[model samples]
Target: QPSTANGGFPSVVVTAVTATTSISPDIESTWKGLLAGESGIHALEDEFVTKWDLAVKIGGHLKDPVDSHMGRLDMRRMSYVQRMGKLLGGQLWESAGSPEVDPDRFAVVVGTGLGGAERIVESYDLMNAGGPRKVSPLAVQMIMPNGAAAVIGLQLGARAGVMTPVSACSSGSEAIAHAWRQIVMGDADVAVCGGVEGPIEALPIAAFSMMRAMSTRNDEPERASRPFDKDRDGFVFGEAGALMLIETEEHAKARGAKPLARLLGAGITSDAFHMVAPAADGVRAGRAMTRSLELAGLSPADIDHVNAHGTATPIGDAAEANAIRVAGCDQAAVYAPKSALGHSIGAVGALESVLTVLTLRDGVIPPTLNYETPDPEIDLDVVAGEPRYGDYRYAVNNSFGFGGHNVALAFGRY
Candidate 1:
């Protein structure tokens, strides 16, 4: 049998990967804190936060924000997302053992939903409040959605295909889908891909808050994000980045690289239903999951676990749950990490994918925090209270964006 038998494509694998989160209250102690069911959401103490009548005074703010190392090389042209991309890209390179792969045969793909909103907000404020002259000339580079991929490629001295996908919340997962194609097509020996978001500004927050899409649990910040709970409110804003190194199986073997996980298959589709709301029937999302399993040449019963894209929003969570049930993975042990990390938007896909991989690697499924009483509306074997121990072979990660963009990726222990 051919090595890449499934889907009639060449075997592409995830050789190495690295996920770096900002210094958040809980993330500061990631491995230790997350397993213990701690949350990063906290009360917003900034002067700007005081003005808002928002009941949810808390958010997942980076504890000790660090300037991008690329700033030193090109500070004049770097934005927050750019810096995060470069940092994560470097970490992926190191994790991949800095393979001696040809630069031309490499690719960089980073996704962002709201790229550099922090910088954009700052620049706009400067132009209106201060003066046009006060706005930095680098504002364009700092705010562009492609800034992260461009800056990371330049910093890594990579001159290959540097692409960026901006698919709202599903951008990161779509970026990985793009990278998977490159390797499978034998276009690149390796690909660096993931997602990032840095939209912790007041204007963006206000915009989302205006839509009543955010949690209003100002008194209990940690409990604001309650996925699959009866008293669920809404998503808590989050900011972070994650990176992964994808390569062909032959290339990884040639370079003696350790295989972290295999990119079994990925499926993508759009609802074409609404701008913000998902299809009431969840037909698109369910089909995407089925397609992903078909591409991987696996049955729904083969999937042992699922890393759900539970954003803690009422409609979003319900839609996703219905989709999962329709996809026939209702018996799978589902895990939702946003309950602990908050909703990182674009970064959530890759971050959750990495968590899925880790779950398979560690033979343990992390518990979904803040889940007091399961909603009868959404029925599934959601692991709660404590982490479950298991050696799962196949896992799936679901990522759905605001504009009805749906994506599902399947992975197997390699």
Candidate 2:
């Protein structure tokens, strides 16, 4: 039998990862805070809240500014998303022991829902204020949707592929799925991939506000994002960047590297039904789940837990819950990281995927925050209040995008 016989492809494993989110800066603190059930959402105090008279005044903005992380001149040409990708890339590679690999067999993939939109807004404002000459010469590099991928790949000197997926919320998961495929197909032996979103600026707030997709719980920001809860109104916007260093299990073993968790398989599907709304029946979404399990050579009964894409929106949560049931994983312990991390758009899937890997690695499940009242319609056993401990093995992370893109990733203990 082949060493990578589980799914008939090369076994891929996540050897190292790093995340910078609204709640914390690095991996250790972020996991500690999350397992403690801390909420990162807060009342917006940025001057933009008053400048734009923003209807939504709550978000999961980063606790530390980028200025604290990087020098000004070094970041002068980079957008916020670019800075995040670079930072996370450096962190992930370093955590992976900075293994040496053939540059030609390396890949980099990063996902962002709205890449450099803030930079676009700033450049447009500059042009309108003075003239076209007022805009920065590097504005094109700053505003491209593939900017993060380009920056990370260039910095890492990856010669294989530098790709970015822009599937709104599922962008990060799709990035991981792509990297997994690349390694399994022998296109690359090593890859750096994940999702990232930068600062929550005026434009995104205004757009989501106008679309009525954000929560109005200004008075209680922490409780604003209550996934699977009865009184859930909507999701609060969030910003984060998370990247994982993955390689073929054989490659990792050859390099004397230790894997944190196994990337078993990934399933991706599209709902051509609506532009932004999910399919109500969740039948297509459920298919993605089953497909992921099938690729991993596992049954629904083999799953021990699920890291849900519970965005807290009325329709989104209900639909995802229905999909979980349809996938026959309702009996598994359900955890909604967005309840604490908030909805970081494209970054949430990767962020939650990291948490899922940690869950399998540490044999613990972080509690979902602010889930006091369960929604009757959404039936599942939710872990709340305190972290749940067990010898957990396998878990699934689900990420769905606004354009009806659905993705499910399977992870197993290494």
Candidate 3:
């Protein structure tokens, strides 16, 4: 029990967790790649890159060299958002041994900053190329950000708390937090919660490039997403989906379930400073970290590893480093997975949180890739090259969004 006492609800634990992406589709592969210091980022070689004369021709795009079970007909029916959510949900549900939780007590929260962004872009393209008749009739369903959540809810038969919060980078982490609240409040016991993002097309990439928010290291895209490095430029758009199976301690115990990790506390904050940029002073970000520590009934000394939201952007890294310092966790062993997998925006928080759990359980923290030179301002002890082996009891994951939204999650070793 923590300082606030589980936020006035029963203790929740991560019973099962999994994620899918271009880097490593399953937990084992992802974990293996993480420790091995492999990068999933590659060069984007499509007309989508050359056509737009895009400044950034690199991303952590999923490798779907070919379609899966979903044929063209199925694509016509189910939106891209729904398809991704369903795929990840199915995979996670199976990974959890398909536990037969009560449908009424089950819930879901799949978040995306830009829900089915490609669907809307395609529809726009069709309409412009032809007319309204050429555009698909399922445009609304395809564009709806909640489509993934809705589909996952239906598949899992979750009748409670089917929420979809869309806070830029924190969307995935926020969904996990929302699901945790449902269990604590006794509204649901087991929930399929995580974040999904599919913005890997020309429109969104162009938008990011226009804002100069993506790295322009066209010569070597793999070495571009260098988080905490002095030569860091910006973040890379990654398309990925990560989901977790969470349940109350009592509920998990009854099911003979083995928890992977315990989500102790969550701290969420928003900066009124800027709409697109981050707060250089890191006041609100630091407050979020402090709140997470308090909610988990712990001090900065209790935390060992900090999975930072190192977006590979110069200002973002500097601000996050200052915030971590102000939170009294400047010396915590830190790792930036975005350095290897790139930033999947809405899905990255949960993705990195999954990595957090793996680190806590496996007693090793993954290395931050492409970190050639350390930034003097970011004085945190960043893990690089080989994995750092240590018995870490408590870990934290920080996720900051475009709207100044800050979310920090504290995890206890199971």
Candidate 4:
């Protein structure tokens, strides 16, 4: 018999995780908030929120100061997104028992949708105010799209590789999938992976406002992101960072690490149909779901719940609903975390994946807040009002991005 460690795909397990969002900096608190169906979206207080004169006024902002979650670090050189990744990486590595693994066989992949843009904006202002010499020497490093992954790699001392996927909203899930691929392909034994974003800035909001892709329900922030609801409008852009420590089962056992859940499989596809809108029929998105089940050797009947990519947009939610129905998973209890957490762009996928794993481990599906009135067109059984409890063996986390990127991750109870 071939040794499991020799080569070929091996079972991957998530050993540790950390999620920081507008809801809370600690995962436990964040999970509690989700179970209670609390809303994190609120009216923005940023100076530009009022002066920019933008139509969209509400967003998700971190409740705690970023520095509160980190130990002493060089804060001056890091941008908001990089700081989020670095701090959350610290928390995840520590929670992962700080397993001492070979640097050569360890990797890092952190995805971000709008990396270093904040740094660029800040630096540009400085350059104008004090000439070209005023910009810091590390501005270029801070402005790199891979800044988050690079910072995490440096902090974790991962020498195997450092990578970043900027596939709009799917970036985080793609990062996790890539790390899983690296481990299964025998390129690495362990990896730190996930997504992070700090796009509560005015500029990003302005851009989304221009596209009319954001919720303009400024009066009722908590009710703005009503996924699967008849009153659904658009996504509430938020900021967040989520990371996980994953390794092959062998590596995890060797390290005596307890797994939170099994990273069974992942499937990625693209709709070549549109840049920002999902395929009306959700054909490719449904294929991604089926393909993920195929890779995990699971049937549609095995899925007990689904963590939907429901951004609450009029068209996107309907498309994803059709995808779920066509994938034969309409019966599964669906929970749309975006309703409560708002849409964190690059970070939402990873954040929702963390929630999915928690659901399997805790055997409870968190409520999808603001689902007071279900859309007549969406026929899926969505969990709302209260948490749903039962034995859940497997669950799927769906993440579809702009530019037609689609990714589905299948997680099994360990």
Q: Relative to the true structure, how large is the alpha-carbon lDDT of every model?
A: 0.79, 0.88, 0.85, 0.88
Residue-pair clashes per candidate, as listed? 1, 0, 0, 0
lDDT of 3 by residue, 171-248 (tens): 999898888778767799889989988747787887777778899987887899999999999998766778999898
Models 1 onward score TM values of 0.92, 0.96, 0.94, 0.95
Which structure is stronger by TM-score: 1 or 4? Answer: 4
The runs of at least 3 residues in candidate 2 whose Cα sits more than 4 Å from the true structure, single-residue gaps closed, are 1-7, 125-135
- Candidate 2 lDDT over 1-414, as tens digits, reads 222435578889999989988888887798999888788899898999999788889988886665478897657888888888888888888888887889999999899988877788798899999999999989999899899999999988899999998899999999999999888888999999999987787877888777777789899999899889999988888778899989988899999999999998889998888998899888889889888888788789988999999988899999998899889999889999988888888888899899999999999998888898899888898988899998777899999899999999999999
Error of 1 at 211 (Å): 1.7
lDDT of 2: 0.88
Q: How big is the positional error of residue 148 in model 3, measured in Å on the Cα after superposition? A: 0.5
As a whole number from 0 to 100, the lDDT of residue 398 in candidate 3 is 96
Ranking by TM-score: 2, 4, 3, 1
Better of 1 and 2 by TM-score: 2
> Which ranges in model 4 have alpha carbons more than 4 Å from their true place?
1-8, 68-73, 128-133
Which predicted model would earn the best TM-score?
A: 2
